[PDB]
Write a protein that binds this ligand. Structure first.
Ligand SMILES: *[C@@H]1O[C@H](CO)[C@@H](O[C@@H]2O[C@H](CO)[C@@H](O[C@@H]3O[C@H](CO[C@H]4O[C@H](CO)[C@@H](O)[C@H](O[C@H]5O[C@H](CO)[C@@H](O)[C@H](O)[C@@H]5O[C@H]5O[C@H](CO)[C@@H](O)[C@H](O)[C@@H]5O)[C@@H]4O)[C@@H](O)[C@H](O[C@H]4O[C@H](CO)[C@@H](O)[C@H](O)[C@@H]4O[C@H]4O[C@H](CO)[C@@H](O)[C@H](O)[C@@H]4O)[C@@H]3O)[C@H](O)[C@H]2NC(C)=O)[C@H](O)[C@H]1NC(C)=O
Ligand SMILES: N#Cc1cc(-c2cc(OC3CC3)ccc2F)c(OCc2n[nH]c3ncccc23)cc1Cl
Ligand SMILES: [Ca+2]
Ligand SMILES: [Ca+2]
Ligand code: NA
Ligand code: NA
Ligand SMILES: [Zn+2]
Length: 805
């Protein structure tokens, strides 16, 4: 109940929220149905429109007008944004040549450059180039400031998940807003775009920038604008707030536009109808910049022009219907559209089975336009599993398609021609970033980066300490002129052991055999040196990874590779080797096919055994350093050491063998050598973080050998591919993956074909950042390069996406 009989007189767009039942004049009052009786009259004035004209210049102040052209308006902070242009002979900001902002040029009393975030809904990345002729203001920001060719949103590529990631630096799974629609089974409550429940504070995790600001003494404007407040009024309210006294004036502001998303859904991303919304957004940008120029703030404020996601062509006829797959279709609830989320209609039904639903959705039609997943099997790059609001069964929908339960759902709801929500590596979902101002660089292009990184930067721009988040602080230092955060490398927690020869062959009883009883002082000393680390400069190019948790491990050296071997997990944490452009692939000779060899540096008690693999009818084994790439027949024997073996389902061995036999060599050819780091990952609770020992749910039968959920590889070379990977003088180039260690290849619908038709496609889907691997392993890579640490941080956040341009 709102007692709506108080008044907004002098309180219009007040910053502090007053408490019920007393009536509100802040810009959320509309959304809560709680504005005072006179809010429209006083706070939403529209008389005479939004622009001065010649005949209004110098007018008598009339408090009814939407904005003012009277002589006192500058001092009142409430001129129309074009007042100086029309009435004082000034130019529009867009018509001024751009000039480097080397230092902030701020009015007296400004403690720090303010930040304005100008967010645009559905602003696809390619609009910057394709719409540039109708967006002159935006094009000046872009060309004069700092810009990326695009910015990667988070999954799902929906509004609230992306805007709240922008505000928190958190993945949706951690902030809680995992879709535009949600059920929380602990609350027994639903979240919708429509209506009231979405404003309850329990939905919203982490700490958004406005709270971070407030808690550290920095004042914030509103971030949420009610749909009924027009854009011109939003801008005027910001400019009014900027004219407040020093002690009252906020330092951080946001504008939001519902366009171009709104029109994009109706007309498609490049509909001829889309030109007008782009023109209109540019006009709003021009209003803000002119307004800032009038206030002498145009060379003082940092402006971020940022989108939440893109837009793709999607029509009603490109809909897959779950009723064409499942008999039981009425026993499920589907969250539909550009992604699918499935749960039981009733938790009173004990005959609901995810296994059989998944199986009925798997590779059932030859051109099937969605793929089902248990959420823990989704590509780890999506980070979309560790929340009770994310249903166990997920459907990744191909770009340009929808999924629905039944046909009736689509026609009893063709309207639309655009939608978004797809996989966040899809080109059509990419969005924009431009930074303009004293703290950003001048005429600088930066590589594409992920929107999870911006919270840290916005905190740096305002002198704030960021709350704990998923950005990698320092990875965006190259965007900034000053206010860099100077990160330092984490300290290594566990130092390795360096074991020598300590065990006789007969001390082992592993059940392994190898045909290797075959015998010189020249080459005896030589092989001794390889086991002491003589080739380690070649195979370990960037120093050894640091172990950032407490554990017990050994560095093992060999001719062709180096490893960090875990006495606790009984396998390497990592294995490092370099394959030159000239290296040769050979086969595993006939006599060595089932060869596994005791490692005399490592005790029986900390070794795997072959008997376990013999008795486990589901599990086989593979090798981290590939025997196919041995540098010589004699060196090949090292690859069969029990300390290089890892457990592998036969189905996964198909993937792994093709990677090691064919793809590594291909990459060495194409990239002029590669350095490879491979290893296991254990993430049984799908939190994206390294499991401790006591979290492992599966072992090789009868043994203490834990089964990885995933295998990783990091593949590094010289960005200047005219230099070989092992003699690179400059910046690096990386691609990585985290492959799920699965007992079937059901994910790949063409897996009965030759590995050349499906394995590389799988690996591309499971592309990863080095940083994703760091979280999953507790390892810190690239510790000894000749590059700056900031540059290395940027490298660690790189994602090789395999999209074209
Ligand atoms: C991305 O960045 C984020 C941010 O850094 C990373 O997330 C952090 O990860 C930490 C480790 O997983 C986690 O630390 C835990 O904190 C617990 C305290 O939690 C509350 O307080 C924090 C801080 O203010 C708050 O942010 C949390 O908010 C969550 O929950 C509410 C709803 O309840 C949501 O509003 C919000 O969206 C958020 O949800 C997300 O996180 C939770 C986990 O907290 C998930 O469950 C959700 O699905 C969702 O993803 C919390 O309100 C603390 O209690 C934990 O301590 C246990 O473990 C330690 C280990 O040292 C041990 O000493 C203790 O014994 C303790 O165990 C006891 O509880 C166990 C479980 O109940 C029990 O089994 C034991 O036997 C014991 O009784 C733990 O320290 C931190 O909270 C989150 N932060 C956030 C914001 O999510 C994330 O990892 C990054 N991702 C990647 C891939 O790198
Ligand atoms: N950084 C950031 C940032 C965050 C938000 C935002 C606001 C929120 O306010 C809480 C609900 C009361 C919640 C979550 C958000 F992420 C944002 O919102 C713009 C917006 N205004 N009006 C809309 N209507 C439909 C959808 C979004 C918005 C804009 C930016 Cl630049
Ligand atoms: Ca949106
Ligand atoms: Ca884990
Ligand atoms: Na076996
Ligand atoms: Na298959
Ligand atoms: Zn939309």
């Amino acid at each position: 109940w709102t007692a709506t009989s108080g008044s907004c007189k002098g309180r219009c767009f007040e910053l502090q929220e007053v408490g019920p039942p007393d009536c509100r004049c802040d810009n959320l009052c509309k959304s809560y149905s709680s504005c005072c009786h006179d809010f429209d009259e006083l706070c939403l004035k529209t008389a005479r429109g939004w622009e001065c004209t010649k005949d209004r210049c110098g007018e008598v102040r009339n408090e009814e007008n939407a904005c003012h052209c009277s002589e006192d308006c500058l001092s009142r902070g409430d001129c129309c944004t074009n007042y100086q242009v029309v009435c004082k002979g000034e130019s529009h900001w867009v018509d001024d040549d751009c000039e480097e902002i080397k230092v902030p040029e701020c009015p007296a009393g400004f403690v720090r450059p303010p930040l304005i975030i100008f967010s645009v809904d559905g602003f696809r990345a390619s609009y910057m180039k394709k719409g540039s002729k109708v967006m002159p203001n935006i094009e000046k920001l872009r060309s004069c400031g700092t810009h990326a060719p695009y910015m990667r949103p988070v999954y799902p590529t929906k509004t609230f998940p992306n805007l709240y990631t922008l505000a928190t630096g958190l993945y949706p799974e951690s902030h809680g807003i995992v879709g535009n629609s949600m059920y929380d089974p602990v609350f027994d409550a639903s979240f919708h775009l429509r209506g009231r429940e979405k404003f309850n504070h329990r939905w919203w995790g982490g700490q958004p920038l406005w709270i971070t600001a407030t808690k550290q003494g920095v004042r914030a404007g509103t971030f949420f604008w009610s749909v009924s407040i027009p854009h011109e009024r939003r801008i005027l309210t910001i400019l009014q707030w900027l004219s407040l006294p020093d002690n009252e004036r906020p330092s951080v502001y946001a504008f939001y536009s519902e366009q171009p998303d709104f029109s994009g859904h109706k007309y498609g991303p490049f509909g001829p109808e889309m030109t007008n919304p782009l023109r209109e957004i540019d006009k709003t940008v021009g209003q803000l910049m002119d307004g800032l120029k009038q206030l002498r703030l145009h060379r003082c404020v940092n402006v971020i022009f940022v989108g939440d996601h893109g837009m793709e062509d999607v029509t009603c006829d490109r809909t897959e219907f779950l009723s064409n797959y499942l008999t039981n279709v009425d026993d499920i609830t589907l969250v539909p559209g550009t992604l699918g989320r499935i749960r039981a209609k009733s938790i009173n039904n004990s005959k609901y089975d995810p296994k059989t639903i998944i199986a009925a959705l798997t590779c059932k039609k030859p051109d099937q336009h969605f793929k089902p997943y248990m959420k823990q099997h989704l590509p780890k790059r999506l980070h979309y599993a560790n929340n009770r609001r994310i249903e166990d069964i997920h459907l990744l929908v191909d770009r340009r398609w929808h999924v629905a339960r039944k046909p009736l759902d689509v026609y009893k709801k063709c309207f639309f021609q655009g939608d978004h929500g797809f996989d966040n590596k899809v080109n059509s979902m990419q969005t924009v970033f431009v930074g303009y101002g004293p703290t950003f660089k001048y005429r600088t292009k930066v590589p594409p980066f992920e929107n999870i990184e911006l919270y840290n930067v916005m905190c740096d721009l305002l002198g704030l300490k960021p709350a704990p988040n998923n950005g990698t602080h320092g990875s965006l230092n190259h965007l900034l002129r000053t206010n860099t955060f100077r990160p330092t490398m984490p300290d290594e927690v566990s130092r390795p052991n360096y074991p020598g020869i300590m065990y006789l062959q007969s001390e082992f009883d592993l059940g392994c055999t190898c045909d290797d009883k075959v015998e010189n002082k020249l080459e005896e000393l030589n092989k001794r040196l390889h086991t002491k680390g003589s080739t380690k400069e070649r195979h370990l190019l960037y120093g050894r990874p640091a172990v950032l948790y407490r554990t017990s491990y050994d560095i093992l050296y060999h001719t062709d590779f180096e490893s960090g071997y875990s006495e606790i997990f009984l396998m390497p944490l990592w294995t490092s080797y370099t394959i030159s452009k000239q290296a040769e692939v050979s086969s595993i000779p006939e006599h060595l096919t089932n060869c596994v060899r005791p490692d005399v540096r490592v005790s029986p008690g900390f070794s795997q055994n072959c008997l376990a693999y013999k008795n486990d009818k589901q599990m086989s084994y593979g090798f981290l350093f590939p025997p196919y790439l041995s540098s010589s027949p004699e060196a090949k024997y090292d690859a069969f050491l029990v300390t290089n073996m890892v457990p592998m389902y036969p189905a996964f061995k198909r993937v792994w063998a093709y990677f090691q036999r064919v793809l590594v060599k291909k990459y060495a050819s194409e990239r002029n050598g590669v350095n490879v780091i491979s290893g296991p990952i254990f993430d049984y609770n799908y939190d994206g973080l390294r499991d401790t020992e006591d979290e492992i749910k599966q072992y090789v039968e009868g043994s203490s050998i834990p089964v990885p959920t995933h295998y990783y590889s990091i593949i590094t070379s010289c960005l200047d591919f005219t230099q070989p990977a092992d003699k690179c003088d400059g910046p690096l180039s990386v691609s990585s993956f985290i492959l799920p260690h699965r007992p079937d290849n059901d994910e790949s619908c063409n897996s009965s074909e030759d590995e050349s038709k499906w394995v590389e496609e799988l690996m591309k889907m499971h592309t990863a950042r080095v940083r994703d691997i760091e979280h999953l392993t507790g390892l810190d890579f690239y510790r000894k390069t000749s590059r700056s640490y900031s540059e290395i941080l940027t490298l660690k956040t790189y994602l090789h996406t395999y999209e074209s341009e």
